[PDB]
Design an enzyme around this catalytic site. Sequence first.
Site, PDB file in Angstrom:
ATOM      1  CG  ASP A   1      -3.532   4.686  -2.411  1.00 50.82           C
ATOM      2  OD1 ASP A   1      -2.810   3.791  -1.945  1.00 50.82           O
ATOM      3  OD2 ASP A   1      -4.334   5.084  -1.899  1.00 50.82           O
TER       4      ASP A   1
ATOM      5  CG  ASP B   1      -1.958   1.042   1.301  1.00 47.79           C
ATOM      6  OD1 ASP B   1      -2.085   1.852   0.350  1.00 47.79           O
ATOM      7  OD2 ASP B   1      -2.602   1.418   2.295  1.00 47.79           O
TER       8      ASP B   1
END
Length: 371
Positions: free
Chosen positions: A222, A37
């Site tokens: 992201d 992440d």
Amino acid sequence: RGSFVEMVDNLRGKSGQGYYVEMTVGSPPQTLNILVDTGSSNFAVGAAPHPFLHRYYQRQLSSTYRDLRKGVYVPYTQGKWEGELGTDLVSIPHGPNVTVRANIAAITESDKFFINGSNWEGILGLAYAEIARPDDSLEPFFDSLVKQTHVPNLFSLQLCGASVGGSMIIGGIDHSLYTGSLWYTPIRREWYYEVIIVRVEINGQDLKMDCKEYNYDKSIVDSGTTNLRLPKKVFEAAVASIKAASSTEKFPDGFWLGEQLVCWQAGTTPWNIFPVISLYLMGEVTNQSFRITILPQQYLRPVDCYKFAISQSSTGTVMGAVIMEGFYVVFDRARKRIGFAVSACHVHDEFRTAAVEGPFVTLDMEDCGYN
Ligand SMILES: N#Cc1ccc(C(=O)Nc2ccc(F)c([C@@]3(CF)N=C(N)OCC3(F)F)c2)nc1
Ligand code: NA
Ligand code: NA
């Protein structure tokens, strides 16, 4: 440098569930699959027998676990976890050949966090200490890696979309994973991987919005988000163009809002009716930019039914997997910059390809940033 055969193909995943890497925590090593992440900064792993989990961290089995005696409560927009902080020895089997003492949040309670049916059981936040919870003195995993070893301060991600796969190259770049040249945009501030978008085109037609709108209130890269999220005003302009450019088929209004799927008879998705989308990013040089272009193969996700995967945001632009699956992306922390190149594995057709092109001349790029 430039060659990392052991790390190629070290990511796995399933459509809609994210890309995870295998890791080991504790002594003896406990193997866990951990979601990658770049949009957060905590290394956090399930540590209790939640029924959706295949495996979880059992601290009682690790002779090297050390308790920080400090809890952590982490609410997101939908979902939350809480956990107990400690440090333990961590390594990455298909990764550099090192062990580091890292912070780990042992998740002991969660809601809407784990995915029922997924094959991962924790999260590796790769962004900076500034967004770490509970605060920025909890050093993130990558910072620990780089302080305690000679691994260089950069990592790169190749996400190959749909069963998905890819490569996380830790400490370097692997040239076989991309074609053409890498182009770099500055990291505007080390918290998220924040960047600046300076122009947006839909099939070569400029949206002609004030460029500050594109980064309202930030734009970030992201890997922990599927969609391309766009600030509400930009999303509205962008949909109106895409809708126009594809106006030869009509779809429910619901479709464009991600509220309804669209389906065609198998092997007949009319990709060619849908426009390419280009983001121009701020370059390394004053008044210089470069442009990344993605296809509908990226923004129409297969669920032959598809979900439109560009959506409105109230948190700024999010360049999620919809962008990253087109490119090889270098998180060059040592030089505070993000590189993009065409990914050697991206999904395309015989007519169009994802593209990274420059230099272009763009004035007043600094004004595009929101304060
Ligand atoms: N393709 C792709 C794909 C598909 C799914 C998932 C995914 O589940 N990501 C996920 C799960 C739990 C999370 F809790 C998060 C957080 C944790 F910080 N990270 C980011 N970046 O934004 C949302 C969030 F909640 F804040 C992400 N990721 C990517
Ligand atoms: Na080092
Ligand atoms: Na190459």
